[PDB]
């Protein structure tokens, strides 16, 4: 559920005079995705109390290990990338799920395997359906090939080439002929005065 779902509070962003740097983080605070366990939360508490005891962002965040949502990248005035992370050391940090402002909108960054396998799912499902629809339909007969039983014929007008040369006199279907040419010559001719 906390994945591809959309969320927005456009009146908020309109109220802010546009996202800047800290205020966009405030928009993340607006988001359901926002965590109470985030270092930004306890730092917000610190602003509520200590107030002055604040130092930009990363200087304040990196020294205070835990859940974080650093702005690694941005595309004003549209996109704003916000990488989640988990600090451990002055150097060490675990990268975590991206969240971003998709124009007054927030979407979690999809995993590659999940959607590649998703499309693979959709495709293979279409393949299953592709097979199931046509199963039990090629009415096979060794004598007569892969017959497809029908309400009527035309419509359109292995190495078994062997037969007697002259044949004639003989018989060989010629199951149907020219009957299509009847009516089709008729309609080609009906348009003739038009031509």
């Amino acid at each position: 559920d906390l994945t591809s779902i959309q969320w927005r509070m456009p009146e908020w962003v309109q109220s802010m005079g546009g996202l800047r740097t800290e205020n966009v983080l405030e928009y993340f605070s607006q988001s359901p995705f926002y965590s109470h366990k985030s270092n930004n939360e306890m730092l917000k508490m610190q602003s509520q109390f200590n107030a002055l005891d604040l130092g930009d962002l990363n200087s304040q965040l990196k020294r205070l290990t835990g859940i974080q949502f650093v702005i690694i990248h941005e595309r004003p005035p549209f996109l704003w990338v916000i990488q989640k992370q988990n600090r451990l050391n002055e150097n060490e940090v675990k990268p975590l799920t991206v969240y971003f402002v998709c124009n007054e909108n927030i979407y979690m960054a999809p995993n590659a395997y999940t959607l590649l396998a998703t499309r693979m799912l959709n495709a293979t499902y279409c393949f299953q359906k592709a097979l199931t629809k046509i199963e039990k339909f090629p009415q096979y007969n060794p004598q007569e090939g892969y017959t497809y039983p029908k309400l009527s014929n035309d419509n359109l007008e292995e190495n078994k080439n062997q037969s007697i040369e002259n044949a004639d006199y003989s018989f060989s279907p010629e199951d149907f002929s020219v009957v299509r040419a009847f009516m089709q010559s008729l309609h080609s001719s009906k348009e003739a005065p038009d031509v």
């Binding site: 499309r119 495709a123 592709a130 004598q143 090939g145 006199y169």
Partner: protein, 148 residues
């Protein structure tokens, strides 16, 4: 008639789209440097933005629900049941085909026992009798039409 291919076109087409989006986004993904994949994308996408929009993000497997493991079982069991039913059904219709089969070539044995020429036809595939074996002037042939 035709509706089978008519629907199947929609199926293969939509699947081809669903795959094409992957082909395109991945081609953008690997055109971050190499020109090998930028060539393969549709112009309509190239017309939009130059690629390499995608970038690495090392963040968890992440995790999977246990019910999916149940799906792994549920799909396969149904597939196996479908397999058994399929083989059994095919044995049935083929058994009926054999029922059609024995009726015919035995009749051909009935005629050949009476000593008559026999010859294959065109794509019609039925064997046929040279009925004018005593002869006279012109040759004569006749397919043994099946009459269910």
């Amino acid at each position: 008639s035709q509706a089978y291919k008519k629907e199947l076109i929609e199926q293969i087409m939509i699947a081809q789209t669903e795959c094409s989006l992957a082909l395109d986004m991945t081609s953008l993904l690997l055109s971050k440097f190499k020109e090998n994949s930028i060539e393969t994308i549709s112009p309509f996408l190239k017309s939009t933005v130059p690629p390499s929009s995608l970038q690495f993000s090392r963040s968890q497997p992440p995790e999977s629900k246990e019910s999916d493991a149940t799906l792994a079982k549920c799909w396969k069991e149904k597939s196996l049941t479908s397999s058994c039913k399929f083989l059994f059904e095919a044995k049935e219709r083929l058994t009926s085909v054999v029922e059609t089969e024995h009726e015919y070539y035995t009749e051909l044995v009935k005629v050949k026992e009476a000593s008559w020429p026999l010859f294959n036809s065109q794509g019609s595939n039925h064997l046929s009798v040279q009925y004018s074996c005593l002869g006279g002037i012109s040759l004569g042939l006749g397919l043994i039409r099946m009459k269910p």
